[PDB]
């Protein structure tokens, strides 16, 4: 159920290089399949293009490890090292 | 109601420099107040820090013109000029 699944999504995303934590995550079942949207933190100095490449890696990683996800939208926001101005999981 | 409001949110955001269209927008009433989350397109060559500054400008612009919004979360994804690989409003 959703709490365990969300934990596994977060652990998988945080293993991808360039990820500075997960800031936002929403997920729901549609039938037996999971639809999720997440926002990861990344280095503010990355270009937006580089951040997209990180989000694509997260998408492959998370989808690759969690069978039951049918759709996973990943995008990014700026996160400086150690900053406490944004939420995290 | 939500369709007119969403139109006005989109028009306001698209007047802010650095915005390459609105890609995603979700909004709901909580009581008489509006809570919204949006994703704007920006130049892939922007840094993530520059994209955040654009999102902050959108937030001031939209909130400044639409009284009834209590919370508006804005973040960004890469959008190349004329590209058709992402949705838009
Ligand atoms: Zn998107
Ligand atoms: Zn955020």
* Number of domains observed in the structure of chain B: 1
- Long-range pairs for A63-69: beta carbons < 8 A, 24 or more residues apart: A65/A8, A65/A12, A66/A5, A66/A8, A66/A9, A66/A12, A66/A34, A68/A5, A68/A32, A68/A33, A68/A34, A69/A9, A69/A33, A69/A34, A69/A35, A69/A36
In-domain check, residue B83 = no
Instruction: State the maximum Cα–Cα separation within chain A, in Å, rounded to a whole number.
Output: 40
Q: How far apart are CA A10 and CA B40, in angstroms?
A: 24
Q: Do B77 and A48 touch (CB under 8 A)?
A: yes
CA angle A75–A80–A81, rounded 5-degree value = 115
- Structure tokens that stand for B32 in this block: 């008489």
Domain assignment present for residue B74? The answer is yes
- Annotate B20-83 with DSSP letters as a single string: --EEEEEEEEETTEEEEEEEEEE-TTSBHHHHHHHHHHHHHHHHHH-TTEEEEEEEEEE--TT-
Could you list the residue range(s) of the whole structural domain that residue A17 is in?
2-78
Domain presence at residue A31: yes
What CATH number is attached to the domain comprising A57? 3.30.70.1350
In 3D space, the residue among B70, B85, B65, B68 whose CA is nearest the CA of residue B23 turns out to be B85
In angstroms, the CA B65 to CA B58 distance is 11
Give the length of chain A: 89
> Out of B44, B47, B75, whose CB is closest to A77?
B75
Cα-to-centroid distance, A84 and ligand 1 (Å): 25
Q: How far are the Cα atoms of A80, B6, B61, B64 from residue A51, in angstroms, in the given order?
A: 14, 27, 25, 29
Task: Look at residue B46 and tell me if it is in a domain.
Answer: yes
Closest CA to A61 of A27, A19, A12: A12
Find the A30 Cα to ligand 1 centroid distance in Å. Answer: 19
């Amino acid at each position: 159920h959703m709490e365990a699944v969300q934990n596994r999504i977060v652990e998988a995303a945080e293993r991808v290089p360039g990820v500075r934590g997960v800031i936002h995550l929403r997920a729901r079942y549609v039938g037996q399949d999971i639809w999720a949207d997440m926002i990861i933190g990344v280095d503010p100095e990355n270009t937006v293009e580089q951040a997209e490449e990180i989000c694509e890696a997260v998408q492959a990683a998370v989808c690759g490890k969690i069978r039951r996800i049918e759709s996973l939208h990943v995008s990014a926001e700026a996160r400086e090292i150690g900053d406490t101005t944004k939420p995290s999981f």
